[PDB]
Amino acid sequence: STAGKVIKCKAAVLWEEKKPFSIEEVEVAPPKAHEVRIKMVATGICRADDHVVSGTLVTPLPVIAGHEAAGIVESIGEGVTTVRPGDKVIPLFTPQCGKCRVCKHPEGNFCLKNDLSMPRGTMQDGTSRFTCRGKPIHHFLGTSTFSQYTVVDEISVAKIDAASPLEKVCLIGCGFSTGYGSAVKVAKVTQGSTCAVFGLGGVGLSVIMGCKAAGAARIIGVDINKDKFAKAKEVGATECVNPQDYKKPIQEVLTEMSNGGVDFSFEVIGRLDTMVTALSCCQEAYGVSVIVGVPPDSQNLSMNPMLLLSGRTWKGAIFGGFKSKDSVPKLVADFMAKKFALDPLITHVLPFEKINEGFDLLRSGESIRTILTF
Amino acid sequence: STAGKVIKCKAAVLWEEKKPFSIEEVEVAPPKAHEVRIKMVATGICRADDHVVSGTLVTPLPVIAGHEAAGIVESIGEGVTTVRPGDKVIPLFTPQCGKCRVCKHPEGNFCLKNDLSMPRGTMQDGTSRFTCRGKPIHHFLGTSTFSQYTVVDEISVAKIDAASPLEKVCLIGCGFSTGYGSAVKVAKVTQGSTCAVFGLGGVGLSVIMGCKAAGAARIIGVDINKDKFAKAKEVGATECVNPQDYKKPIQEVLTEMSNGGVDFSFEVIGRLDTMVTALSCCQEAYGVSVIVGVPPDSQNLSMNPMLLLSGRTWKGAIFGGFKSKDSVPKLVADFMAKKFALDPLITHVLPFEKINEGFDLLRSGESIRTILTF
Numbered sequence: 001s002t003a004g005k006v007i008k009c010k011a012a013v014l015w016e017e018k019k020p021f022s023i024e025e026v027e028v029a030p031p032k033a034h035e036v037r038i039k040m041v042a043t044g045i046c047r048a049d050d051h052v053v054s055g056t057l058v059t060p061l062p063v064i065a066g067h068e069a070a071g072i073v074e075s076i077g078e079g080v081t082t083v084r085p086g087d088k089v090i091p092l093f094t095p096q097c098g099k100c101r102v103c104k105h106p107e108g109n110f111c112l113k114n115d116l117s118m119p120r121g122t123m124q125d126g127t128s129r130f131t132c133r134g135k136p137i138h139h140f141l142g143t144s145t146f147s148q149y150t151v152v153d154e155i156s157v158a159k160i161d162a163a164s165p166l167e168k169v170c171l172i173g174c175g176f177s178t179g180y181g182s183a184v185k186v187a188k189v190t191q192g193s194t195c196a197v198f199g200l201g202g203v204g205l206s207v208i209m210g211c212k213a214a215g216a217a218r219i220i221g222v223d224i225n226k227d228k229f230a231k232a233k234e235v236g237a238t239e240c241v242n243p244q245d246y247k248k249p250i251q252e253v254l255t256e257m258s259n260g261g262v263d264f265s266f267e268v269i270g271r272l273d274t275m276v277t278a279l280s281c282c283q284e285a286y287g288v289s290v291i292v293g294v295p296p297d298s299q300n301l302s303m304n305p306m307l308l309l310s311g312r313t314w315k316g317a318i319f320g321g322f323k324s325k326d327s328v329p330k331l332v333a334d335f336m337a338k339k340f341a342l343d344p345l346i347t348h349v350l351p352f353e354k355i356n357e358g359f360d361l362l363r364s365g366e367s368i369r370t371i372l373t374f
Numbered sequence: 375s376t377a378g379k380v381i382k383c384k385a386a387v388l389w390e391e392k393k394p395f396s397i398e399e400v401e402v403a404p405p406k407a408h409e410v411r412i413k414m415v416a417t418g419i420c421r422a423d424d425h426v427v428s429g430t431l432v433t434p435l436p437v438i439a440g441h442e443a444a445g446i447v448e449s450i451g452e453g454v455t456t457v458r459p460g461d462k463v464i465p466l467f468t469p470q471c472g473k474c475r476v477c478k479h480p481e482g483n484f485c486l487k488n489d490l491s492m493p494r495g496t497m498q499d500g501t502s503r504f505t506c507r508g509k510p511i512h513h514f515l516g517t518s519t520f521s522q523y524t525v526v527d528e529i530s531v532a533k534i535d536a537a538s539p540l541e542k543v544c545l546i547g548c549g550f551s552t553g554y555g556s557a558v559k560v561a562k563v564t565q566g567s568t569c570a571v572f573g574l575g576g577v578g579l580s581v582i583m584g585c586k587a588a589g590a591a592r593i594i595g596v597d598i599n600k601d602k603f604a605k606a607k608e609v610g611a612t613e614c615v616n617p618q619d620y621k622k623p624i625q626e627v628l629t630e631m632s633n634g635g636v637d638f639s640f641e642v643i644g645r646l647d648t649m650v651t652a653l654s655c656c657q658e659a660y661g662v663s664v665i666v667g668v669p670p671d672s673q674n675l676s677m678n679p680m681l682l683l684s685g686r687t688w689k690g691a692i693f694g695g696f697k698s699k700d701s702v703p704k705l706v707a708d709f710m711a712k713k714f715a716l717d718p719l720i721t722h723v724l725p726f727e728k729i730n731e732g733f734d735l736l737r738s739g740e741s742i743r744t745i746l747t748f
């Protein structure tokens with residue numbers, strides 16, 4: 001009784017940067033060709049959403065943000081073949097068109113049809129499906145999950161197992177998969193290795209989980225919020241260090257702790273100084289440093305290229321290096337086979353209409369992931 | 375009639391930067407325990423030698439430079455077990471102690487006994503075996519091959535096949551092996567890939583050889599000296615471009631030619647701007663960029679970390695990543711098996727007394743490698 005109709009729902013609308021989300025009435029157009037309209041079930045509060053509010057990440061405004069979520073398909077567009085109404089799905093902020101050079105490449109997963117390099121904030125067709133107060137609203141990374149109903153392109157949605165728990169697997173839409181894959185797929189952490197993880201948020205804890213499952217012997221967590229240390233050790237960190245506790249830059253301390261440098265370091269914060277510090281603290285002849293955190297907009301860092309000439313490898317990745325549409329259903333199956341845990345990451349559960357409050361939990365440091373439920 | 379005696383011979387002493395080499399008479403102390411004294415037969419002129427003369431690379435002065443070379447063992451010290459008097463050898467500007475954390479690592483080659491991170495300009499015991507005009511002279515990278523005789527620590531010398539032509543395998547002491555390994559061992563160039571090589575000197579041409587040996591489909595050479603293009607195509611380049619011919623930045627031209635970025639790029643010059651350019655011109659989701667050139671001393675570059683977050687890999691290496699003492703004798707055997715060619719790299723052959731004109735052949739852009747014979 002909704003298929004082909006404009007839907008009546010409510011969504012968290014951002015009107016200007018640095019302002020709270022305005023819960024308002026929105027009009028969600030029905031799906032066009034190769035498009036999917038999804039009833040939302042559960043969505044996470046990711047730091048990347050906050051970067052939109054802070055201006056750290058620049059996308060066209062006004063927008064409905066949100067990108068870490070899982071729901072039920074409400075209706076399908078002309079030509080849709082991968083999902084039907086009633087399937088559980090997870091929208092993909094990194095699409096997998098399957099037709100570009102990156103999708104055919106064995107390693108790449110940053111599909112060229114992505115809306116992240118030059119943000120337009122539209123569907124693949126360049127228009128918007130969202131109307132609030134009669135004005136057109138931008139999409140976010142082709143997902144826009146801060147809504148009871150959203151519409152996504154087919155290449156930005158993955159059908160997942162019909163028995164999966166939606167309040168937990170929504171993190172496979174971003175936080176967990178990014179951190180987990182950064183360790184096991186991007187850095188490719190080895191057995192018996194020593195790792196250093198900068199940032200103990202949701203992504204950073206997932207990096208720790210991946211390092212441990214990869215068989216690392218030492219995992220050093222680094223965070224200026226010592227309240228994060230308990231859960232970091234819970235998921236696998238062997239030690240935690242607070243840079244504010246030392247009179248030396250943390251890279252010397254880490255280099256001394258690791259008897260000459262760690263095998264793998266991860267920057268999971270999004271600051272220029274910690275990216276160079278993370279690179280410096282891995283072993284100069286064979287260390288690998290992976291940038292996961294997002295720096296603010298337009299920022300050049302400074303580094304001495306002698307740090308690389310000695311033998312270091314420096315790399316980054318989106319979404320833990322996973323080809324999104326292929327990997328997400330597999331990761332959900334893995335979760336159901338209890339191959340990894342997601343509950344350590346969920347620190348509270350709130351109803352969706354209280355999106356704004358749950359955000360201040362993130363920026364005040366009490367939370368890892370808050371799950372907004374619908 | 376020399377074993378155990380001070381030898382008095384010719385040496386090219388460099389007393390200060392930006393001035394010619396002073397060909398003179400020096401006193402070469404006999405080897406102490408675990409040291410080897412070598413009669414030099416052939417030495418190549420590497421750009422890294424020129425960097426000490428220009429101050430680009432700072433090592434203690436006065437010095438006997440040279441590090442790309444081959445000779446015959448004159449005598450060995452007490453305890454030497456790997457070489458004997460009469461052996462053909464190549465001194466290793468990167469040692470292989472075999473005992474440090476890096477030597478034990480499967481992938482690393484930058485042995486912690488190197489004299490490159492913190493140059494002392496001495497033997498491993500901290501003293502010098504060179505005396506010239508009253509003064510003790512500094513060693514260079516534990517090799518100092520611009521001398522009739524040098525003394526090197528055992529961990530810095532490799533025994534090679536006795537049927538080797540020293541006038542041509544000396545390039546395995548640096549130039550060839552550095553470029554070749556940067557492609558086949560560090561980048562791991564794949565078959566059918568497109569590569570970009572910045573800098574078409576001896577090291578850069580060896581990168582091209584490695585890319586071709588690795589089965590690259592396109593190899594784009596980049597040099598502002600268009601006289602380098604012929605010999606580059608000879609050893610495998612499919613295309614060459616001169617940045618001075620373009621109005622738009624060369625990485626734009628290269629991304630352009632490669633339909634979105636190359637698979638592998640190599641900086642083999644030693645300039646900060648070209649290292650950033652080489653990185654930018656590889657494909658943003660899965661490109662790999664390798665720094666081979668040495669920048670001027672203590673200089674930072676500036677770059678946008680978003681270039682890595684999309685999926686690029688940025689790394690460097692000393693000596694093409696080869697474990698020196700293990701690889702040099704095996705590379706010589708490969709040359710002896712005609713598995714690779716060194717002739718393309720040798721453009722001039724001069725006697726050691728004309729060291730200064732061979733340096734001027736390099737600085738004028740006329741030569742690739744000049745081989746000095748004693």
Ligand SMILES: NC(=O)C1=CN([C@@H]2O[C@H](COP(=O)(O)OP(=O)(O)OC[C@H]3O[C@@H](n4cnc5c(N)ncnc54)[C@H](O)[C@@H]3O)[C@@H](O)[C@H]2O)C=CC1
Nearest residue numbers: 047178199200201202203223224225269270293294318319
């Ligand atoms: N590459 C990708 O695909 C993705 C990147 N990200 C980015 O990774 C970062 C983390 O995401 P979340 O875990 O959700 O964020 P978070 O904000 O929850 O955790 C970040 C941690 O960094 C700590 N921190 C802040 N400044 C620090 C400093 N100077 N030194 C040490 N620790 C410091 C904080 O105490 C905090 O605990 C963000 O930049 C996010 O935008 C997030 C998802 C996907």
Ligand SMILES: NC(=O)C1=CN([C@@H]2O[C@H](COP(=O)(O)OP(=O)(O)OC[C@H]3O[C@@H](n4cnc5c(N)ncnc54)[C@H](O)[C@@H]3O)[C@@H](O)[C@H]2O)C=CC1
Nearest residue numbers: 421422573574575576577597598599643644667668692693
């Ligand atoms: N990483 C390692 O283990 C080693 C590093 N090196 C360094 O590699 C670099 C190259 O070594 P060589 O081939 O022997 O030097 P080279 O001087 O023989 O070749 C350098 C090439 O760079 C070209 N060039 C200079 N400026 C350029 C620019 N803006 N754009 C494009 N091309 C430019 C020059 O025309 C020249 O052909 C040097 O920095 C050398 O010190 C050398 C041996 C080992």
Ligand SMILES: O=CNC1CCCCC1
Nearest residue numbers: 046048067093174294318
């Ligand atoms: O967190 C989800 N997506 C992020 C990925 C890194 C760049 C900013 C957007």
Ligand SMILES: O=CNC1CCCCC1
Nearest residue numbers: 420422441467548668692
């Ligand atoms: O060319 C030989 N050795 C070089 C290696 C890179 C640092 C400077 C010295």
Ligand SMILES: [Zn+2]
Nearest residue numbers: 046048174175
């Ligand atoms: Zn996210």
Ligand SMILES: [Zn+2]
Nearest residue numbers: 097100103111
């Ligand atoms: Zn694609």
Ligand SMILES: [Zn+2]
Nearest residue numbers: 420422548549
């Ligand atoms: Zn050299």
Ligand SMILES: [Zn+2]
Nearest residue numbers: 471474477485
């Ligand atoms: Zn060693």
